[PDB]
Design a protein around this ligand. Structure first.
Ligand SMILES: [Mg+2]
Ligand SMILES: [Mg+2]
Ligand code: NA
Ligand code: NA
Length: 326
DNA sequence: CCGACGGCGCATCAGC
DNA sequence: GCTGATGCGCC
DNA sequence: GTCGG
Protein backbone atom coordinates (compact mmCIF):
# COMPACT_ATOMS: atom_id res chain seq x y z
CA UNK A 1 0.00 0.00 0.00
CA UNK A 2 2.35 2.65 -1.35
CA UNK A 3 -0.61 4.61 -2.75
CA UNK A 4 -3.12 3.86 -0.02
CA UNK A 5 -4.53 7.40 0.12
CA UNK A 6 -5.10 7.48 -3.61
CA UNK A 7 -6.79 4.14 -3.88
CA UNK A 8 -8.94 4.84 -0.83
CA UNK A 9 -10.03 8.01 -2.58
CA UNK A 10 -10.91 6.22 -5.75
CA UNK A 11 -12.77 3.36 -3.98
CA UNK A 12 -14.85 5.98 -2.09
CA UNK A 13 -15.66 7.63 -5.46
CA UNK A 14 -16.50 4.25 -6.96
CA UNK A 15 -18.88 3.61 -4.04
CA UNK A 16 -20.58 7.01 -4.61
CA UNK A 17 -21.08 6.26 -8.29
CA UNK A 18 -22.55 2.85 -7.50
CA UNK A 19 -24.75 3.65 -4.54
CA UNK A 20 -25.81 7.26 -5.19
CA UNK A 21 -25.42 8.02 -8.92
CA UNK A 22 -26.28 4.44 -9.87
CA UNK A 23 -23.70 4.77 -12.67
CA UNK A 24 -22.23 1.25 -12.75
CA UNK A 25 -19.52 1.94 -15.35
CA UNK A 26 -18.31 4.88 -13.39
CA UNK A 27 -18.10 2.53 -10.39
CA UNK A 28 -16.18 0.09 -12.57
CA UNK A 29 -13.77 2.63 -14.07
CA UNK A 30 -12.94 3.79 -10.54
CA UNK A 31 -12.43 0.28 -9.15
CA UNK A 32 -10.30 -0.54 -12.13
CA UNK A 33 -8.07 2.57 -11.72
CA UNK A 34 -7.78 1.83 -8.01
CA UNK A 35 -6.72 -1.71 -8.79
CA UNK A 36 -3.93 -0.87 -11.31
CA UNK A 37 -2.68 1.91 -8.93
CA UNK A 38 -2.69 -0.56 -6.00
CA UNK A 39 -0.16 -2.89 -7.70
CA UNK A 40 1.92 -0.04 -9.14
CA UNK A 41 5.24 -0.60 -7.32
CA UNK A 42 6.25 3.06 -6.78
CA UNK A 43 4.92 5.85 -4.55
CA UNK A 44 3.03 8.04 -7.11
CA UNK A 45 4.32 11.62 -7.39
CA UNK A 46 1.78 13.05 -9.81
CA UNK A 47 -1.50 12.74 -11.67
CA UNK A 48 0.45 12.75 -14.95
CA UNK A 49 2.49 9.73 -13.79
CA UNK A 50 -0.67 7.82 -12.83
CA UNK A 51 -2.16 8.66 -16.21
CA UNK A 52 0.37 6.36 -17.80
CA UNK A 53 -1.35 3.39 -16.18
CA UNK A 54 -4.07 1.73 -18.24
CA UNK A 55 -7.34 2.79 -16.62
CA UNK A 56 -6.14 6.12 -15.25
CA UNK A 57 -7.41 8.95 -17.52
CA UNK A 58 -7.62 12.75 -17.41
CA UNK A 59 -10.22 13.33 -14.66
CA UNK A 60 -8.62 10.76 -12.31
CA UNK A 61 -5.17 12.25 -12.91
CA UNK A 62 -6.56 15.70 -11.84
CA UNK A 63 -8.06 14.22 -8.68
CA UNK A 64 -4.73 12.51 -7.95
CA UNK A 65 -2.91 15.91 -8.30
CA UNK A 66 -5.45 17.62 -6.02
CA UNK A 67 -5.09 14.73 -3.57
CA UNK A 68 -1.30 14.87 -3.49
CA UNK A 69 -1.00 18.61 -3.06
CA UNK A 70 -3.70 19.02 -0.39
CA UNK A 71 -4.28 15.55 1.22
CA UNK A 72 -7.95 15.78 0.33
CA UNK A 73 -10.49 15.78 -2.42
CA UNK A 74 -13.03 18.65 -2.45
CA UNK A 75 -15.46 16.53 -4.47
CA UNK A 76 -15.48 13.87 -1.71
CA UNK A 77 -15.79 16.44 1.12
CA UNK A 78 -18.97 17.71 -0.47
CA UNK A 79 -20.35 14.16 -1.03
CA UNK A 80 -19.50 13.44 2.62
CA UNK A 81 -21.52 16.44 3.92
CA UNK A 82 -24.63 15.59 1.86
CA UNK A 83 -27.23 13.93 4.17
CA UNK A 84 -28.89 12.11 1.31
CA UNK A 85 -25.71 10.59 -0.06
CA UNK A 86 -24.48 9.53 3.38
CA UNK A 87 -27.86 8.01 4.08
CA UNK A 88 -27.87 5.98 0.87
CA UNK A 89 -24.27 4.95 1.27
CA UNK A 90 -25.01 3.72 4.77
CA UNK A 91 -28.22 1.74 3.89
CA UNK A 92 -26.58 -0.04 0.92
CA UNK A 93 -24.18 -1.47 3.44
CA UNK A 94 -26.92 -3.87 4.62
CA UNK A 95 -26.75 -7.04 2.53
CA UNK A 96 -29.83 -7.13 0.28
CA UNK A 97 -30.27 -3.31 0.24
CA UNK A 98 -28.86 -1.84 -2.94
CA UNK A 99 -29.04 1.61 -4.61
CA UNK A 100 -32.73 1.47 -5.38
CA UNK A 101 -34.09 0.12 -2.08
CA UNK A 102 -31.67 2.49 -0.33
CA UNK A 103 -33.02 5.61 -2.04
CA UNK A 104 -36.51 4.30 -1.55
CA UNK A 105 -36.03 3.96 2.26
CA UNK A 106 -34.76 7.53 2.54
CA UNK A 107 -37.90 8.67 0.75
CA UNK A 108 -39.65 7.44 3.86
CA UNK A 109 -37.39 8.61 6.66
CA UNK A 110 -36.08 5.07 7.22
CA UNK A 111 -32.41 6.10 7.16
CA UNK A 112 -30.43 4.99 10.24
CA UNK A 113 -29.70 1.58 11.85
CA UNK A 114 -32.32 2.42 14.45
CA UNK A 115 -34.94 3.16 11.74
CA UNK A 116 -34.29 -0.24 10.15
CA UNK A 117 -34.59 -1.95 13.53
CA UNK A 118 -38.07 -0.57 14.24
CA UNK A 119 -39.10 -1.40 10.66
CA UNK A 120 -38.17 -5.03 10.04
CA UNK A 121 -41.59 -5.60 8.48
CA UNK A 122 -40.59 -3.34 5.61
CA UNK A 123 -37.58 -5.57 4.75
CA UNK A 124 -37.60 -8.66 2.62
CA UNK A 125 -35.95 -11.74 4.09
CA UNK A 126 -32.44 -11.21 2.72
CA UNK A 127 -32.50 -7.65 4.11
CA UNK A 128 -33.84 -8.71 7.48
CA UNK A 129 -30.97 -11.19 7.83
CA UNK A 130 -28.40 -8.61 6.55
CA UNK A 131 -29.61 -6.23 9.27
CA UNK A 132 -29.55 -9.01 11.89
CA UNK A 133 -25.84 -9.67 11.22
CA UNK A 134 -24.97 -6.13 10.22
CA UNK A 135 -22.04 -5.83 12.61
CA UNK A 136 -20.74 -9.40 12.16
CA UNK A 137 -20.72 -8.98 8.34
CA UNK A 138 -18.31 -5.99 8.73
CA UNK A 139 -15.71 -8.21 10.30
CA UNK A 140 -13.03 -9.97 8.28
CA UNK A 141 -12.33 -13.69 8.74
CA UNK A 142 -8.77 -14.62 9.64
CA UNK A 143 -7.31 -17.53 7.67
CA UNK A 144 -6.99 -19.52 10.87
CA UNK A 145 -10.81 -19.42 11.15
CA UNK A 146 -11.15 -20.00 7.40
CA UNK A 147 -9.11 -23.19 7.97
CA UNK A 148 -11.49 -24.56 10.72
CA UNK A 149 -14.51 -23.61 8.57
CA UNK A 150 -12.96 -25.57 5.75
CA UNK A 151 -12.45 -28.76 7.72
CA UNK A 152 -16.05 -28.56 8.77
CA UNK A 153 -17.44 -28.01 5.26
CA UNK A 154 -15.10 -30.59 3.68
CA UNK A 155 -15.86 -33.21 6.32
CA UNK A 156 -19.65 -32.74 6.33
CA UNK A 157 -19.85 -32.88 2.54
CA UNK A 158 -17.82 -36.12 2.54
CA UNK A 159 -20.39 -37.55 5.06
CA UNK A 160 -23.48 -36.98 2.84
CA UNK A 161 -21.65 -38.49 -0.12
CA UNK A 162 -18.01 -39.48 -0.44
CA UNK A 163 -17.95 -38.19 -4.02
CA UNK A 164 -18.82 -34.54 -3.54
CA UNK A 165 -15.72 -32.41 -3.90
CA UNK A 166 -15.83 -29.00 -2.15
CA UNK A 167 -13.22 -26.48 -2.89
CA UNK A 168 -12.79 -23.19 -1.04
CA UNK A 169 -12.36 -20.36 -3.44
CA UNK A 170 -12.39 -16.61 -3.22
CA UNK A 171 -9.63 -14.69 -1.60
CA UNK A 172 -8.91 -17.79 0.56
CA UNK A 173 -7.83 -19.77 -2.50
CA UNK A 174 -5.73 -16.69 -3.47
CA UNK A 175 -3.81 -17.23 -0.20
CA UNK A 176 -5.23 -14.12 1.55
CA UNK A 177 -4.49 -13.77 5.27
CA UNK A 178 -8.04 -12.69 5.89
CA UNK A 179 -11.26 -13.09 3.92
CA UNK A 180 -14.56 -11.22 3.78
CA UNK A 181 -16.51 -14.48 3.55
CA UNK A 182 -16.37 -18.18 2.55
CA UNK A 183 -16.87 -19.19 -1.11
CA UNK A 184 -17.34 -22.86 -1.79
CA UNK A 185 -17.35 -24.64 -5.10
CA UNK A 186 -19.21 -27.95 -5.09
CA UNK A 187 -19.21 -30.82 -7.56
CA UNK A 188 -20.73 -34.28 -7.75
CA UNK A 189 -20.31 -36.86 -10.59
CA UNK A 190 -24.13 -37.06 -10.96
CA UNK A 191 -24.36 -33.43 -12.12
CA UNK A 192 -22.67 -32.66 -15.43
CA UNK A 193 -23.27 -30.46 -18.49
CA UNK A 194 -25.09 -33.48 -20.02
CA UNK A 195 -27.57 -34.37 -17.28
CA UNK A 196 -28.44 -34.16 -13.63
CA UNK A 197 -28.74 -37.80 -12.60
CA UNK A 198 -29.61 -36.80 -9.05
CA UNK A 199 -31.94 -34.08 -7.75
CA UNK A 200 -31.33 -32.04 -4.55
CA UNK A 201 -27.53 -32.31 -4.77
CA UNK A 202 -27.18 -28.80 -3.26
CA UNK A 203 -30.10 -29.12 -0.86
CA UNK A 204 -28.60 -32.16 0.80
CA UNK A 205 -25.33 -30.40 1.53
CA UNK A 206 -27.21 -27.34 2.96
CA UNK A 207 -29.49 -29.49 5.21
CA UNK A 208 -26.42 -31.36 6.45
CA UNK A 209 -24.57 -28.12 7.31
CA UNK A 210 -27.72 -26.91 9.08
CA UNK A 211 -28.03 -30.19 10.98
CA UNK A 212 -24.53 -29.56 12.50
CA UNK A 213 -25.43 -25.85 13.29
CA UNK A 214 -22.80 -24.62 10.91
CA UNK A 215 -25.30 -22.93 8.53
CA UNK A 216 -27.52 -20.67 10.64
CA UNK A 217 -29.56 -18.67 8.02
CA UNK A 218 -30.41 -18.56 4.31
CA UNK A 219 -30.41 -15.39 2.20
CA UNK A 220 -31.32 -17.22 -0.99
CA UNK A 221 -31.30 -20.78 -2.25
CA UNK A 222 -31.83 -22.44 -5.66
CA UNK A 223 -30.72 -25.68 -7.41
CA UNK A 224 -27.14 -24.41 -8.07
CA UNK A 225 -26.55 -21.54 -5.63
CA UNK A 226 -26.86 -21.08 -1.91
CA UNK A 227 -26.38 -17.70 -0.35
CA UNK A 228 -26.56 -17.70 3.44
CA UNK A 229 -24.91 -17.39 6.87
CA UNK A 230 -22.68 -19.69 8.98
CA UNK A 231 -20.76 -19.65 12.31
CA UNK A 232 -17.87 -21.61 13.81
CA UNK A 233 -18.60 -23.51 17.06
CA UNK A 234 -17.12 -21.92 20.17
CA UNK A 235 -15.89 -23.80 23.28
CA UNK A 236 -17.13 -23.64 26.91
CA UNK A 237 -17.42 -20.02 28.12
CA UNK A 238 -15.80 -18.54 25.01
CA UNK A 239 -17.57 -15.53 23.49
CA UNK A 240 -19.16 -16.64 20.15
CA UNK A 241 -17.53 -16.31 16.74
CA UNK A 242 -19.09 -13.62 14.51
CA UNK A 243 -21.59 -14.90 11.97
CA UNK A 244 -20.15 -15.14 8.45
CA UNK A 245 -21.49 -15.02 4.92
CA UNK A 246 -21.17 -18.30 3.08
CA UNK A 247 -21.78 -18.89 -0.56
CA UNK A 248 -22.05 -22.34 -2.06
CA UNK A 249 -22.03 -22.82 -5.81
CA UNK A 250 -22.74 -26.16 -7.46
CA UNK A 251 -21.06 -26.41 -10.87
CA UNK A 252 -21.24 -29.23 -13.43
CA UNK A 253 -18.37 -31.60 -12.67
CA UNK A 254 -16.92 -31.49 -16.18
CA UNK A 255 -16.81 -27.65 -16.04
CA UNK A 256 -14.76 -27.49 -12.86
CA UNK A 257 -11.94 -25.36 -14.34
CA UNK A 258 -14.09 -22.55 -15.67
CA UNK A 259 -16.01 -22.74 -12.41
CA UNK A 260 -12.94 -22.64 -10.18
CA UNK A 261 -11.43 -19.80 -12.32
CA UNK A 262 -14.64 -17.82 -11.89
CA UNK A 263 -14.99 -18.40 -8.10
CA UNK A 264 -11.30 -17.77 -7.32
CA UNK A 265 -11.55 -14.24 -8.72
CA UNK A 266 -11.00 -11.61 -7.81
CA UNK A 267 -14.06 -9.78 -9.17
CA UNK A 268 -11.80 -7.26 -10.90
CA UNK A 269 -9.45 -9.98 -12.18
CA UNK A 270 -12.46 -11.71 -13.71
CA UNK A 271 -13.74 -8.50 -15.34
CA UNK A 272 -10.32 -7.81 -16.91
CA UNK A 273 -9.74 -11.38 -17.95
CA UNK A 274 -13.23 -11.66 -19.47
CA UNK A 275 -12.80 -8.23 -21.09
CA UNK A 276 -9.55 -9.51 -22.66
CA UNK A 277 -11.23 -12.70 -23.77
CA UNK A 278 -13.66 -10.52 -25.78
CA UNK A 279 -10.78 -8.58 -27.47
CA UNK A 280 -9.25 -11.95 -28.30
CA UNK A 281 -12.63 -12.91 -29.74
CA UNK A 282 -13.69 -15.43 -27.06
CA UNK A 283 -16.13 -15.27 -24.21
CA UNK A 284 -15.67 -16.89 -20.79
CA UNK A 285 -18.22 -17.51 -18.12
CA UNK A 286 -18.19 -19.92 -15.10
CA UNK A 287 -18.92 -22.84 -17.41
CA UNK A 288 -17.03 -22.60 -20.63
CA UNK A 289 -14.90 -20.51 -22.94
CA UNK A 290 -16.51 -20.14 -26.35
CA UNK A 291 -15.23 -18.47 -29.52
CA UNK A 292 -16.91 -15.47 -30.88
CA UNK A 293 -18.40 -16.05 -34.29
CA UNK A 294 -18.17 -13.74 -37.23
CA UNK A 295 -21.48 -12.20 -36.52
CA UNK A 296 -21.07 -11.82 -32.82
CA UNK A 297 -22.59 -15.07 -31.59
CA UNK A 298 -20.95 -17.54 -29.20
CA UNK A 299 -19.74 -20.67 -30.97
CA UNK A 300 -19.34 -24.02 -29.23
CA UNK A 301 -17.53 -24.81 -25.94
CA UNK A 302 -13.77 -25.20 -26.40
CA UNK A 303 -12.12 -28.14 -24.58
CA UNK A 304 -10.65 -27.17 -21.20
CA UNK A 305 -8.38 -29.44 -19.14
CA UNK A 306 -6.96 -27.07 -16.57
CA UNK A 307 -7.21 -23.50 -15.51
CA UNK A 308 -4.17 -22.83 -17.66
CA UNK A 309 -5.91 -23.85 -20.90
CA UNK A 310 -8.24 -20.95 -20.32
CA UNK A 311 -5.31 -18.56 -20.14
CA UNK A 312 -3.66 -20.17 -23.19
CA UNK A 313 -6.66 -19.49 -25.46
CA UNK A 314 -6.62 -15.80 -24.68
CA UNK A 315 -2.83 -15.57 -24.95
CA UNK A 316 -2.16 -14.85 -21.29
CA UNK A 317 0.73 -16.42 -19.37
CA UNK A 318 -0.51 -18.42 -16.39
CA UNK A 319 -1.23 -16.53 -13.19
CA UNK A 320 -1.45 -18.43 -9.92
CA UNK A 321 -4.39 -17.75 -7.60
CA UNK A 322 -2.17 -15.58 -5.38
CA UNK A 323 -1.39 -13.28 -8.36
CA UNK A 324 -5.09 -12.78 -9.15
CA UNK A 325 -5.81 -10.37 -6.31
CA UNK A 326 -6.57 -7.35 -8.50
C1' DC B 1 -15.56 11.36 -31.39
C1' DC B 2 -18.42 7.60 -29.27
C1' DG B 3 -19.81 2.83 -28.54
C1' DA B 4 -19.03 -0.62 -25.08
C1' DC B 5 -17.66 -1.76 -20.66
C1' DG B 6 -18.31 -9.71 -17.73
C1' DG B 7 -21.55 -12.91 -16.87
C1' DC B 8 -25.03 -15.07 -14.62
C1' DG B 9 -28.08 -17.12 -10.07
C1' DC B 10 -32.10 -16.02 -7.18
C1' DA B 11 -36.02 -13.10 -5.40
C1' DT B 12 -39.52 -10.25 -6.86
C1' DC B 13 -42.78 -8.04 -9.77
C1' DA B 14 -45.79 -6.84 -13.73
C1' DG B 15 -48.36 -8.27 -17.38
C1' DC B 16 -50.93 -11.69 -19.55
C1' DG C 1 -49.00 -20.04 -13.32
C1' DC C 2 -45.59 -18.53 -17.09
C1' DT C 3 -42.24 -15.28 -19.16
C1' DG C 4 -39.31 -11.59 -19.05
C1' DA C 5 -37.55 -7.27 -16.59
C1' DT C 6 -35.49 -5.35 -12.70
C1' DG C 7 -32.78 -5.60 -8.16
C1' DC C 8 -29.24 -7.43 -5.82
C1' DG C 9 -25.65 -10.53 -4.96
C1' DC C 10 -21.21 -13.50 -6.18
C1' DC C 11 -16.40 -13.80 -8.24
C1' DG D 1 -14.59 7.53 -16.47
C1' DT D 2 -11.54 5.45 -19.84
C1' DC D 3 -10.23 3.39 -24.00
C1' DG D 4 -9.77 1.56 -28.92
C1' DG D 5 -11.06 2.18 -33.43
MG1 LIG E 1 -15.12 -14.15 -0.25
MG1 LIG F 1 -19.38 -14.87 -0.32
NA1 NA G 1 -4.03 5.81 -18.80
NA1 NA H 1 -26.14 -3.85 0.15
Amino acid sequence: TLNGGITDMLTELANFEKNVSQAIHKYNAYRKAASVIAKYPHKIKSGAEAKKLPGVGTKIAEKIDEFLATGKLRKLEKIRQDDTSSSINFLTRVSGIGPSAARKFVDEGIKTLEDLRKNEDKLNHHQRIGLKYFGDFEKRIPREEMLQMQDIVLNEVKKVDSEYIATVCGSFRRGAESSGDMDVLLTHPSFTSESTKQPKLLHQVVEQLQKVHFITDTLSKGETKFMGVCQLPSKNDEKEYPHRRIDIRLIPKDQYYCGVLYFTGSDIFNKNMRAHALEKGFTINEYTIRPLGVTGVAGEPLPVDSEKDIFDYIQWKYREPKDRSE
